[PDB]
């Protein structure tokens, strides 16, 4: 059972892709993908089909957030690309930079930059990832969320992992700066909230003691003490 | 305008190849199918390869045993008729499992020899095994190891990697702790000590780290 | 000198435990290596009536390695040197409470690293394997040497092998930085910190360790620690070794710039680092356009060094400097959030609006660079009227 | 070939180590705003209506 022919493994991968499209069963998809790449690795198969399998599993593991599985897939894809395989080098280099942003690995980002070519950096996905990394490191939440709004490919799926913490940092910066009140419409615009309901759902657990009975705006002077809690 | 007034998978991109392990060890790692190291592996392998003491508390199934298996296989200088790695655990099942892990991670290093001893079997057989082909790794229960060290059938003067599996279970008891203390006393003072267990209570942590010289402690 | 005389000298050195003499008779930085008679193909028959094991095998491998280095072909020279390290470690571990083979270990490890580099060059030329493959094996051998040295703790201070620990740590650091596996330096840093001799090692080894650890700390965004370690390393360097001082400065300049200290043009010319002149001038003047042009011009050099990310936070400092320039030019405390927009547009920053100006100023105030707040109702930023831009050193 | 090279001597005790006399500048941050870049910025602000 450990030795599985490549043709049967291709058929299984196609069936799992179709099943994920039809039903989106994440536990079944992850179990199937893990078995597939286990059978690939026990046989030491490093080829275009291997890079395709790892790409498919990494893309599946972003619709349902699984940082561990995505990290496994991407750290295998790095070596698969280094072995002169076609894959999607620009796309998954963008995803690698984005995951390093998520885990806050400045050294890994520097290492990735040290091996970027002109034709790679010309890719739109990696260009968006580099712009997002610059906005995040520079603390530019406006550019960060402007790029997060229209994120090419599945970049937004990665950004969603640290979108909430970036929003919290941006809100701390805004409360420390916007006085005597901060309109919630400004939060809606800056933090890239697709709905007043979603914006208020994000705002509610913090408990920032909004001004006015209707809670039209955040009272930042009163909420300054609340900043340290979150 | 008023004026302003004053887990199971590591999250690091570092595979087993990034641990600078032996090629014969990396081949076995790939063969067994370990794609990406666990968090405890990523935290303990670099420290354990350098021959330094380790204290680890991690849940079962997180690749805890493979950590010290790779650690002891990396720094193994195998010479005939000499034991340099000793593994002690309170259960025969764990000893058999760790012996199987050692066998699995050494299919590309024919020099390394591993032997297993436990209760329920005649000590004469263990003495015959030690004399006929003295291994470089010995895995066993504290009682059998203590008996073999007492009856002068096993040479403990060459131990350089003395490690415990489920250190909590052994160090909670009294007879087991006495046997462990005696065996550690017989071993040389220049060696590496590592202790792995599932649940390390704060009462056993001092008596657990009493056997190590500035160990790296990690608890999950 | 004849081979018999050389081996008799080696035997006398080993018998008298002359560490310096034995190191000179095994290192490749000695004129005896150039002696054609000493270089032999199969000294296996010899050295056995002279040297007790494993010294016989070690020095026979050294003779073979000298013959190799004479006849190029560094791959099997490195193989012979690996044999030398493996044979010497077994003898070094036998020395109980006597660190007389430390110079021998130093020379052997240095030659092992050099031959690993040369064999990697030859292997790259052959095309069989990628660059840095022999660095991993050299790192494994140096790890074995390090653990052999470190396991000796019960010996006295005057006879402890722990004195030979920082050298091996530095060699491992060099290998790791060559192969970019900087995550492997944490156990070595912890071991050196826990050691009681970290302030008593040789000055060269201490300086190299401080430089590498500060570089790693900068690589991990620990700027205060990196500044301290790299400042120590820069302060303590030999006058003759100017290349080492230049390498110190390469990674010390970004951290000192981030902390608020600017390198001088005199220093840059003295240590031949003129890639930082335009960057320093732009950061000092608050010139975003000049900073972008300089970072684009020296992009290859900065990427190769590994300081591009650390130098792009000089953009954060440049933002503060440019806004301070705007505030000083306007001489008003209730500044308009459109003057900063005009300045940013003049700095040729693509797609800049009042929203991005507000975001930049909010981040600056959050980081403490600016003491003020944003009204957002009258579209104006108010400053503190006293210390609106605190010194970068305090922040 | 850009790598930290070995020192010639194992110790120097600081007698022959190089000491750099104030190679760091910390007084560059000042209220003085007069250079060419400052003049360019002032001209741009004046063009856009800010004095």
Residue numbers in the entry:
A (entry chain A): 571 to 800
B (entry chain D): 10 to 15, 38 to 251
C (entry chain B): 4 to 398
D (entry chain C): 16 to 66
Task: Cite, word for word, the article reporting this structure.
The DEAD-box ATPase DDX39B (also known as UAP56) is a multifunctional regulator of nuclear mRNPs. TREX-2.1 is composed of three subunits, LENG8, PCID2, and DSS1, and shares the latter two subunits with the nuclear pore complex-associated TREX-2 complex. Cryo-EM structures of TREX-2.1/DDX39B and TREX-2/DDX39B identify a conserved trigger loop in the LENG8 and GANP subunit of the respective TREX-2.1 and TREX-2 complex that is critical for DDX39B regulation. DDX39B contains an N-terminal motif (NTM) and two RecA-like domains (RecA1 and RecA2) that form the ATPase core.
We used a similar photo-crosslinking approach to obtain a TREX-2.1/DDX39B complex for cryo-EM studies. A cryo-EM map of TREX-2.1/DDX39B, refined to an overall resolution of 3.28 Å, reveals that the RecA1 domain of DDX39B binds to the concave face of the V-shaped TREX-2.1 and that the RecA2 domain binds to the tip of the LENG8 leg with significant flexibility. We also obtained a set of particles that feature the best densities for the RecA1 domain of DDX39B, which yielded a cryo-EM map of the TREX-2.1/DDX39BNTM+RecA1 complex with an overall resolution of 2.97 Å. While the interaction interfaces between DDX39B and PCID2 are the same for TREX-2M and TREX-2.1, TREX-2.1 features unique interactions at the LENG8 interfaces with DDX39B. For example, the NTM-C of DDX39B in the TREX-2.1/DDX39BNTM+RecA1 complex is sandwiched between LENG8 and the RecA1 domain of DDX39B, while the NTM-C features a more extended conformation in the TREX-2M/DDX39B complex. At the RecA1 interface, a key interaction is mediated by Y624 of LENG8 and D66 of DDX39B. Structural and sequence alignments between LENG8 and GANP suggest that LENG8 contains an equivalent trigger loop (residues 559–570): a conserved YxR motif at the N-terminus as well as enriched proline residues at the C-terminus. Structural overlay of TREX-2.1/DDX39B and TREX-2M/DDX39B shows that the trigger loop in LENG8 is positioned in proximity to the nucleotide binding site of DDX39B. The LENG8 trigger loop in the TREX-2.1/DDX39B complex does not show significant electron density, suggesting its dynamic nature. The TREX-2.1/DDX39B structure captures an open conformation of DDX39B after both ADP and RNA have been released (step 4).
